[PDB]
Amino acid sequence: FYEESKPFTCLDGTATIPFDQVNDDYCDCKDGSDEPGTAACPNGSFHCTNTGYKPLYILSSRVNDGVCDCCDGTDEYNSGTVCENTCR
């Protein structure tokens, strides 16, 4: 009657998790692939989209650390630090 969506599988195959465990601020994959948008995994990476300029990857531990790491400031979205765009 109603077809269900498939779960998330870690990029390293270590687990299959519901999509509510993706960016849920808890590390479920040994490669950090379930948490690209948070600080939850010790070996994850956050992508600075830097719209208009060169994109950069930073350590997950620098997401919401209160420090401006991306020139576009997208790494600081719920820390209290408001980063200015400095990509130019």
Binding site: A39, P42, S61, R62, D65, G66, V67
Partner: peptide, 15 residues
């Protein structure tokens, strides 16, 4: 605090 960041101020509100 299992989320080791660059300094303690960075970690002091963490789980």
């Amino acid at each position: 605090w299992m989320r080791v960041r660059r300094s303690s101020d960075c970690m002091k509100d963490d789980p």
